[PDB]
Design a binder for this molecule. Sequence first.
Ligand SMILES: CC(=O)[C@H]1CC[C@H]2[C@@H]3CCC4=CC(=O)CC[C@]4(C)[C@H]3CC[C@]12C
Length: 255
Amino acid sequence: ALVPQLSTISRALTPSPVMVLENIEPEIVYAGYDSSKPDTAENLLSTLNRLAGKQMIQVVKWAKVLPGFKNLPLEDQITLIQYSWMSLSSFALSWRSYKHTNSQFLYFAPDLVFNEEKMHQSAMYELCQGMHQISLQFVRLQLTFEEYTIMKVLLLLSTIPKDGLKSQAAFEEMRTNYIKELRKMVTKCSWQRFYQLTKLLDSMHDLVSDLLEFCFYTFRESHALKVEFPAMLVEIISDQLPKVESGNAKPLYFH
Ligand SMILES: CC(=O)[C@H]1CC[C@H]2[C@@H]3CCC4=CC(=O)CC[C@]4(C)[C@H]3CC[C@]12C
């Protein structure tokens, strides 16, 4: 006569966290690249920035439905996103390059694929090589989509403020849960692969530092360099630059 609150049906039908990530993976975004304009550094970079703005809008929508992310306080939900935006951007860039081009090119968007030439023309050739190296690693490792999605969540939880987050305890829980996910995922029916993946995540820090250095530089000199940044990026970079440059961003490592 009393309706049970617990639900055996609901509990069994609930998809795995790995299945939820697959369900919420953002759809590919177009850059709106106009090949009728010359491929100068000013145009290529502005285009990339516009693409970045469109991508971050989807990343935010992704962060709202991310399991466990809602357990953290709002302030720690914005800081983590502003701190890891470059890392998520570069890592998703490598995944698309790997899946869509076998890591032969940098697949920024279906309408914008960089070959060596555009890499030189972009005026950030070495950085492009840096991100392309990660794509090559996806091939040697035969990274799987499941491994990818988990790794991306970890990147979102890879950089925190020096003084700490509002809920450092809640943060530690979520990060631990996802590291577990990757742990059980890399398990054959294992430690060497888990090692290769963790070191891959760690290497993202130095790469991201280099990308950010170029980003902060082009941002402060955008007028002189004529590189346009969309609203979404001005917001993110205006908050991140003074924090990163002041030694207030702490990177988390596995090794
Ligand atoms: C203009 C500039 O400084 C460049 C240097 C690093 C570049 C970013 C590198 C990573 C990246 C990957 C993408 O798929 C979208 C654009 C972004 C987010 C790039 C936007 C333009 C940046 C920020």
